[PDB]
Amino acid sequence: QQLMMILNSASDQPSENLISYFNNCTVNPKESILKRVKDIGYIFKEKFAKAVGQGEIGSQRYKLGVRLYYRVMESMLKSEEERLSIQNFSKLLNDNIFHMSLLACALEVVMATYSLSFPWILNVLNLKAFDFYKVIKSFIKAEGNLTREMIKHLERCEHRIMESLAWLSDSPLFDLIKQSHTAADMYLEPVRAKKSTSLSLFYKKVYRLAYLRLNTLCERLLSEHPELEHIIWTLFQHTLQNEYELMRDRHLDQIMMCSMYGICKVKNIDLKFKIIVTAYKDLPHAVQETFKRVLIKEEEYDSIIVFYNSVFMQRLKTNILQYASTRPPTLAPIPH
């Protein structure tokens, strides 16, 4: 509630300290920024009314959004003025996806407080989840007044992007995989190259999530062969790096769960999917759809026991059976 007061008493235009940054740029960004907020005003209010009906509020959410947007931009530019060359500084301040993502993230903060759920704001602004993802941590860090509940919200957004939304079709994540540290660093990367800080950072975090989640399920279910934890992870991680195509329009936890059943299967352990899914409903955000509605092929859906048999084994029979021979694949690092 303390940030909400700073916003309502604040202005709808950029600060004087903020505009100086705009003037220190080689290409003054101010008119393209301002036009961008105005141009976005229309589409926001439109789609906002297309869901909440006939109110005036759409206009009000957005103007608080804009108020946060400029506040944070100014906070963020304060660190980046020492970090970035003059030409990088200006490139940032004229970069459209940077602004789309900063504003989209301000707006999600207002929306969520006054609760149209995430990922609503991405569909409204036609912003890819993987581009939006890049702004979240730097946004949090630059707005010291976010409440706990709000921080937790942006992180649930971030985790859902890592777990699902970044892996949708047409997402730039797959483009970047084919080829192979602040938000400004990631937005300044050219679309055409070198190694991508965006991709490496994303995977680094995905692994920590996946392993953390996988770890939770293993301490509950797999203690009579506790060695299995590290084994399952090696398959899980090997699959995320080199068989990444299976995450297309899928969920990290679907891949997680198959790696569990497969590894205990090939070590001749009898422990069915039934115990896995029931125990998984107990994860902090688990929805049973994660395993009741799983995609197989060509837009046809079935339960997870079907995905494991028809899609997962097709690809990994070579890989999984490796784990039972006399020279099994070497163990993957546990993410820090």
Numbering used by the authors: 383 to 437, 440 to 499, 512 to 576, 600 to 612, 642 to 784
Paper text:
The retinoblastoma tumor suppressor (Rb) is a multifunctional protein that primarily regulates the cell cycle but also has roles in cellular differentiation, DNA damage response, and apoptosis. Essential functions of Rb occur through its pocket domain, which is necessary for regulating binding interactions with E2F transcription factors and transcription repressors that bind via an LxCxE motif. The pocket domain is the most highly conserved region of the multidomain protein, as well as the most frequent site of mutations. Protein X-ray crystallography of four missense variants reveals how mutations destabilize the protein fold and inhibit E2FTD or LxCxE binding.
